[PDB]
Structures are given as structure tokens and as C-alpha cells.
Amino acid sequence: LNNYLHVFYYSWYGNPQFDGKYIHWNHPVLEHWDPRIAKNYPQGRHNPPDDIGSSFYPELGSYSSRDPSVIETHMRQMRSASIGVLALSWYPPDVNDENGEPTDNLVPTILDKAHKYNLKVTFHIEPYSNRDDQNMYKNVKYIIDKYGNHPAFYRYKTKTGNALPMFYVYDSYITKPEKWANLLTTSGSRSIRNSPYDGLFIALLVEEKHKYDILQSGFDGIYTYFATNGFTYGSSHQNWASLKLFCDKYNLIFIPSVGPGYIDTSIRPWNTQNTRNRINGKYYEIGLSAALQTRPSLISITSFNEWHEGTQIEKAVPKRTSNTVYLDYRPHKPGLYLELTRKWSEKYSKERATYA
């Protein structure tokens, strides 16, 4: 199993059988700002189980994230792809994304199923409202306290030989660098350094200018997130060679993010310009290759199951309804992207042995 390969996991899906209502599968269609353009595009909410807010359709159907057999199936799928760590999208207690319900309750149940299958869980801290250094302190404390002692809880073994919690921080540039300094540098106001709530904090790099923002802040590494090649400076594959060199120069952990494709037109119908076709896994493989060539300490995959954005590697079946033809993995099997991940996971693990 590959402890140096991470996948972004989402636990925000609900259905009537396990939740009493659909959550996320019933997604609003997001109206365009200009009435002239919005007139022409679908409006309202998707009506599951047949009509979901995705271009693809899951083998497990419009599933609930809290269904224990679903979590188990997911774990087995990851296992079969040689992914060791799942980076769990996280919001604080009783907070959630705008189309979801709080998901911190699932964490104990997710950890259990992860350990059952010898997987590790790390945390992907979402931009919850009024996130700053203070409540970031509180929430890092929360995570390490509640979940730190669980056997599935992920720690990365440093060069020093000290195993530390990892935190991926999405949209980290929202908070000013000098506020992050309070949390992330040794002399900071509310510094987590050399305390029991220490960790490797990974900042999201969108733009070139952020290199210096991140340096100031005290972050331990950078990650690119976006599946779309060339959507941002960071998600452009060509800029990776450059970013690796920068991270090695200032002792940062560079974690590139690779995706199978992108299509979110089921919930943003104008946004065809950002669609990247999977071209039967060739786009995913060109991604992985580019990521491997940087000789990185870790690699991340966007995503396991972001169904809305069409970036999932989870199993997907062909499906057609009264007025939709879902995209599928044909001519290949439902497990294609898991099967491809495995091949590249193994190549990576054998190569990584020679730069450790």
C-alpha cells in the first residue's frame, strides 16, 4: 500500500433511506448572472435518484455517505487503487458547505472503516466562514484531540524522524500571511509549533505571487488541487518543474494534484469552456506522468468522489433516463480509474524508494 499517495474524499452525500432527505445529489443549477444567458439554461434542483447533479453516474447510485456499506465499498475501491491515505473534506462542528449538512459527525465512523481496511485519514480544511488563525487554532486542537489517537489517523514521517498530522488548507490565501504567522511560525502569538497540536500544514497555491505569501506564513508545503490542467498557475502542469525547484530551495513539501478530467456542466451549464474530456483515461495518465517527473514527496488525486465537478475516480456505470445520457467509462469497465491509479501508484512507489 502507498502511504505517499492521497485522494480527496467527500462525505457530504445524503439520501432518504439513511438521511431522510437527499443531500448534494439534489443540487441547484446555479443561475448565470446575466438574465440574457440564464434564460436559456436549466433552473431548479435535480430530482434524484434518476436525475442527479453530476455528468457521471455512480455504481453505488445516489448513495448516502453515512451508509456503512457505502463507506466500506469506498475503502475497498481505494485499496484496489493502492491509495493509502484519504484526504477528507472537513468543516467544523455544526458547519457545512452551502448545499450540504454538517459532516464532522461522520469522522468517527469514517476512521473506523478506514482502519478496518488499513487506510489512513488526513484532513482537508475547507474555507468555512470567518476562518482565521484563532478558530484555525481551535479546530486543529479539536481534530488532534478527538481523532489524534485513532489508529487510522494519518501522520507523515518527516526527514527528522518525527511523525506529524497533515492538514491541507483549501483557499489558504484568503487569510493574510501575517495572521497565518501567528499560527504557523515558532515565535507566533498562538503558535502550534513544538506543542501537542503541531503538524505539517499544506497551503493551496493558485497564483505565482503566492510562493512568497506561503513562505512568510509558516506553511510546511504547497498543493495545487485543481484537476483542470492550466486553470490556475498552480494547476498548470508546465509550472510544476518550476514549483518543485522552489519548494526544494525553501524546504517545503510539494504535493501536486492530478485529476482524471473535469465536467461540471450539470450544475454550471454555461461552463463548457472548463470541461476536459477524459479521453479514456489518457488525460489522467498524462497528469500522473507529469506529477511523477517532478520526483515529489507526496502526490494527491482530485478527487475520489467530487461527482458535481466530474473529477471522481470512483466506480461509475452507464446510465440513461427520460432525457439524460450520463457520461461513462466505456469502452472500459466501471473500475478503470482505480485500475489506472494502481498502475501509477506502483510505478511511483518503486521510484520514490530512490529519493525517499
Curated annotation (Swiss-Prot):
Highly expressed in the liver and kidney. Expressed at lower levels in muscle, pancreas, heart, placenta, lung and brain. It is found in: Golgi apparatus membrane. Residues 1-356 are lumenal. It catalyses: N-{alpha-Glc-(1->3)-alpha-Man-(1->2)-alpha-Man-(1->2)-alpha-Man-(1->3)-[alpha-Man-(1->2)-alpha-Man-(1->3)-[alpha-Man-(1->2)-alpha-Man-(1->6)]-alpha-Man-(1->6)]-beta-Man-(1->4)-beta-GlcNAc-(1->4)-beta-GlcNAc}-L-asparaginyl-[protein] + H2O = alpha-D-glucosyl-(1->3)-D-mannopyranose + N(4)-{alpha-D-Man-(1->2)-alpha-D-Man-(1->3)-[alpha-D-Man-(1->2)-alpha-D-Man-(1->3)-[alpha-D-Man-(1->2)-alpha-D-Man-(1->6)]-alpha-D-Man-(1->6)]-beta-D-Man-(1->4)-beta-D-GlaNAc-(1->4)-beta-D-GlcNAc}-L-asparaginyl-[protein] (N-glucan mannose isomer 8A1,2,3B1,2). Undergoes proteolytic cleavage in the C-terminal region. The keyword Acetylation does not apply. Its main location: Golgi. The keyword Nucleus does not apply. Optimum pH is 6.2. Its EC number is 3.2.1.130. GO terms for molecular function: alpha-mannosidase activity; glycoprotein endo-alpha-1,2-mannosidase activity. This is Glycoprotein endo-alpha-1,2-mannosidase. It comes from Homo sapiens (Human). The gene is MANEA. The chain holds residues 99 to 454 of 462 of the full protein.
